[PDB]
Write a protein that binds this ligand. Structure first.
Ligand SMILES: CC(=O)N[C@@H]1[C@@H](O)[C@H](O[C@@H]2O[C@H](CO)[C@@H](O[C@@H]3O[C@H](CO)[C@@H](O[C@@H]4O[C@H](CO)[C@@H](O)[C@H](O)[C@H]4NC(C)=O)[C@H](O)[C@H]3NC(C)=O)[C@H](O)[C@H]2NC(C)=O)[C@@H](CO)O[C@@H]1O
Ligand SMILES: CC(=O)N[C@@H]1[C@@H](O)[C@H](O)[C@@H](CO)O[C@H]1O
Ligand SMILES: CC(=O)N[C@@H]1[C@@H](O)[C@H](O)[C@@H](CO)O[C@H]1O
Length: 540
């Protein structure tokens, strides 16, 4: 007779191709990439003959075979593809094979193949759009937004984006390499801990807890190998396979290391580490370079060189070459993008007409034109055009776009920036003709989280009632609110100014729109980004 029916032993059924060390703070130790997951199964046979061969099947296909030598057995084998499997143990002899009932096992991988899709309802004022305009609709999500702001990946209105950028991936380096981080309490030290035993100029993760370990919706079980932002982003990819999720390297306070990459030894090491990063974290679809900025005038007053423009173009070329190789190895398309200054003076330090051949999208940072850092010269921080009271205004969206076009950048490359926050001043005074911008300020407006910056959500929620004046400047295409008694003045984007930008993008055949930061919107801004680019209402 055929053997008795084996009983699969109670035991761990969750395995991982990329393992995460739960007691490690250094990125080198935190993550272990393997070619395959080490899987184990045991069984008992309570009734009958134990057969002469034991097999482990995954969805009916043999993953392991060995002699059946007793009433209990154990099998260890490798599984090299992520997902969920119906595992059985079968005992065979010359008279037949007898298979156990199936037990599901989970083999995790960083493409999120083991995860249920993270398909969450739209929150706040967010309304559903189909991505059918063919235009970019992008936004940045910040790693630390999960703390005080409590804005997690499950709160991202993901169906209303083409591109989701993760800010920010740091580049390893201590004294002289990441000095800008020292301005943020504990932040430099956090990076040094993450990069312990890791070479300068390789990428890492700034806050491994937030990125990988913090319990979040859909990734709360203790033996879920990827939690935090990355785990949720993996599940998000399962829900939105066409969403481009890009890691953004740099940003204001993590940009210092770019200034050393004129040394090709360092640049090669960096590009290599990015490749490794993408091979490790498979849910990512490319890389965004947020170098602020070639030539300097970023966070660090002691960095910036005339060489930086050349370095930028070389970096983009070499990144593209690495990504092209990754693409044909994987059969995937990878994107290369960059967030850049919108100031003409800044833009002309770089030959974007050359660099564009390496890039899928240029994220034009057409915001922060004005702010609390200058209390004497006030203006619209993210306007399309100059205002009527100062038509020679240098920093406008159109001037940034025109600077790029003048170089020879193709318009389809250019993605225009919208702000999901306001900047502002307090104590504004000495202004003429009921235009507060013509006055001067005494300090920054009180901020939502940091001085001089207000979440759009709070502007809409608090500063569009009471004593607050509201004005839409139709010449600049820019709203502002003003509280005369305290001289609080806030410049921001609203649904109408975003609409003007979208129409401008369509008229000029630009690439689309993107925003910073997604956590600060109540839905109004992203709704308008979608609508104005011609995306159809409804779900796809
Ligand atoms: C287009 C352009 O070039 N605009 C610039 C403008 O950026 C300059 O102003 C600077 O802006 C950057 C953001 O772009 C500010 O940096 C952020 O600062 C905050 C506060 O420290 C950082 O948040 C903290 O991050 C840590 C992790 O390091 C978390 O642990 C904390 O929870 C978190 N704290 C809070 C309260 O959120 C954040 O990481 C920084 N972001 C980045 C990407 O670096 C910078 O402070 C700001 N500097 C000044 C002086 O305002 C502006 C300066 O004049 O010039 C242009 O307008
Ligand atoms: C005030 C606050 O939220 N602090 C958090 C802390 O809980 C967490 O352990 C750490 C991990 O980097 O990030 C920060
Ligand atoms: C990289 C870094 O220092 N991240 C910190 C995080 O540890 C802390 O929880 C948070 C609190 O707001 O501030 C940020």
């Amino acid at each position: 007779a055929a053997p008795g029916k084996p009983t699969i032993a109670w035991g761990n059924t969750k395995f991982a191709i990329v393992e995460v060390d739960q007691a490690a703070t250094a990125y080198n130790n935190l993550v272990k990439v393997k070619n395959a997951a080490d899987v184990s199964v045991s069984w008992n046979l309570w009734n009958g003959d134990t057969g002469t061969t034991a097999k482990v099947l995954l969805n009916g296909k043999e993953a392991w075979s060995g002699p059946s030598t007793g009433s209990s057995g154990t099998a260890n084998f490798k599984v090299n593809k992520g997902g969920r499997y119906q595992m059985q143990v079968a005992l065979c002899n010359a008279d037949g094979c007898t298979a156990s009932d199936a037990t599901e096992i989970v083999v995790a991988d960083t493409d999120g193949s083991h995860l249920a899709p993270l398909k969450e309802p739209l929150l706040e004022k967010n309304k559903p759009y189909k991505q059918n305009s063919g235009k970019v609709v992008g936004s940045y999500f910040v790693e630390w937004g999960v703390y005080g702001r409590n804005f997690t990946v499950d709160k991202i209105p993901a169906q209303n984006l083409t591109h989701l950028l993760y800010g920010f991936i740091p580049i390893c380096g201590g004294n002289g390499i990441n000095d800008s981080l020292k301005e943020i309490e504990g932040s430099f030290q956090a990076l040094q801990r993450s990069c312990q035993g890791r070479e300068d100029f390789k990428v890492s993760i700034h806050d491994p807890f937030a990125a990988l370990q913090k319990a979040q919706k859909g990734v709360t079980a203790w033996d879920d190998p990827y939690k935090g932002n990355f785990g949720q982003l993996m599940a998000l990819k399962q829900a939105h396979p066409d969403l481009k999720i890009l890691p953004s390297i740099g940003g204001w306070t993590l940009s210092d290391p770019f200034f050393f990459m004129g040394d090709k030894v360092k640049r090669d090491r960096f590009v290599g580490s990015v490749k490794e990063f993408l091979q490790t974290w498979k849910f990512f679809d490319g890389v965004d370079i947020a170098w602020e900025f070639p030539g300097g005038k970023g966070a660090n007053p002691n960095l910036g060189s005339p060489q930086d423009g050349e370095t930028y173009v070389l970096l983009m070329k070499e990144l593209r070459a690495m990504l092209d190789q990754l693409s044909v190895e994987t059969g995937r398309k990878y994107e290369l993008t960059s967030a850049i200054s919108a100031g003409k003076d800044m833009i002309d330090k770089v030959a974007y007409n050359v660099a564009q051949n390496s890039m899928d999208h240029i994220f034009l940072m057409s915001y922060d034109f004005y702010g609390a850092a200058d209390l004497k010269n006030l203006g619209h921080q993210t306007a399309l055009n100059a205002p009527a009271w100062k038509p020679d205004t240098a920093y406008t969206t159109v001037n940034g776009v025109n600077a790029l076009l003048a170089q020879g950048v193709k318009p389809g490359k250019i993605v225009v920036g919208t702000a999901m926050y306001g900047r502002g001043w307090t104590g504004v005074n000495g202004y003429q003709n009921n235009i507060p911008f013509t006055g001067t300020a005494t300090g920054p407006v009180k901020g939502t989280w940091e001085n001089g910056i207000v979440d759009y959500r709070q502007i809409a929620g608090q500063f569009m009632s009471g004593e607050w004046q509201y004005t839409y400047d139709a010449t600049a295409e820019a709203p502002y609110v003003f509280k005369p008694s305290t001289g609080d003045l806030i410049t921001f984007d609203d649904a109408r100014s975003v609409q003007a930008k979208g129409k401008y993008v369509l008229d000029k055949q630009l690439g689309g729109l993107f925003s910073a930061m997604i956590d600060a919107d109540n839905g109004d801004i992203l709704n308008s980004m979608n609508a104005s680019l011609g995306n159809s209402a409804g779900v796809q």
